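Our platform keeps sequence and structure together, in a single record for each protein. Because each token names a local backbone shape, the row as a whole describes the fold. One such record is reproduced below, unchanged from the form in which we store it:
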Amino acid sequence: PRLVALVKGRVQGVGYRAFAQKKALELGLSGYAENLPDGRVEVVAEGPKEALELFLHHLKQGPRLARVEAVEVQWGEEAGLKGFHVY
């Protein structure tokens, strides 16, 4: 399946995207983590539900300087993303 997450809090300037990329690739997930102009981060990942939930657990924590307020999520269908890209 596809996970679409909107990450809110103190999540830019804290190495969050590369953190998400590493956790995604360790789980064989594909997708992306993109910085938004308001300070939030859009994260999309595709793969098995169990792997996506573990990944989502990581997104809710972030690296040690991050302060994740909330991760709003929706579940959808895989489009065929491959590899994990930051932007």
Observations:
- The chain has one domain: 1-87.
- The first strand starts at residue 2 and ends at 10.
